[PDB]
């Protein structure tokens, strides 16, 4: 019995160390790499959050069907992340009727820097234009955010402007 | 069997642990220096608040 | 020296490991599931709570 075939082996055991060893760096970096794509991205989730500021205005008819426009601002915390308008979208709902995600929005393609707002302006579909009296939701979602709902309902009363 | 290669491998688990050490911490200061910012911007938010003074 | 007795071993360590590692799985199952037990009854305990209402 020779050394001369364990070498033959030892070779064998060796390469496929090296092997597994030479994937498993591989298999940790991009395991390690994961690893720090979810925690920028989990950071980013939390602090991507947007925000409504201060009151919601809105234009009003009488003689007309409704609430037409309405006015809120909309900001990102000055800690926050930067933004796009274009990919937030606005559901709606006039006194517990079935959602309907909105579609005329004025600052249709802006982005927000953190710590910045901008006045969005919302008109309610045909159907969904609410009176005075009537209760809507305003649900503000954000692309990687915490989505926001802003429930409200026009004192009945209302000629217009701010909604208290 | 010879443990030989038992440490060619055992480099490979403490390279990829030196690695991920590397990155966790890198990614953990980050994380901390994140979680410190918002913490700033969290108190900037509530105490930079302007007031209307009297009439 | 031959690695054909190499062999006879290389299986020893690779069961002891599958069977290690079936149990740890088995053993890992019962920990999560165990570790999922306490988190039901853990909001469960919270939950459950009971009031007196009114006079």
């Known amino acids: 019995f020779s050394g001369l075939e364990a070498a033959i082996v030892l070779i064998a055991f060796v390469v496929v160390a090296a092997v597994f060893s030479y994937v498993m760096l591989g298999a940790g970096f991009f395991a390690t790499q994961k690893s720090q794509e979810v925690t920028y991205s989990g950071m980013k989730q939390a602090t991507s959050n947007l925000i409504l500021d201060g009151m919601i205005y809105g234009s009003y008819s009488k003689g007309g069907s409704g609430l037409a426009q309405l006015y809120f601002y909309v900001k990102v915390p ?3 992340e930067t933004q796009d308008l274009k990919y937030v979208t606005y559901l709606w709902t006039k006194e517990n009727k079935a959602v309907t995600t909105l579609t005329s929005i004025t600052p249709t393609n802006q982005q927000l820097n953190p710590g910045a707002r901008v006045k969005v302006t919302i008109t309610a579909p045909t159907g969904y234009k609410p009176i ?33």
């Open 78 to 80: 000055e800690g926050g």
């Open 132 to 164: 005075a009296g009537q209760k809507f939701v305003l649900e503000i979602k954000p692309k990687t955010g915490a989505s926001t709902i802003v429930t409200r309902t026009l004192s009945d009363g209302y000629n217009g402007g701010v909604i208290i």
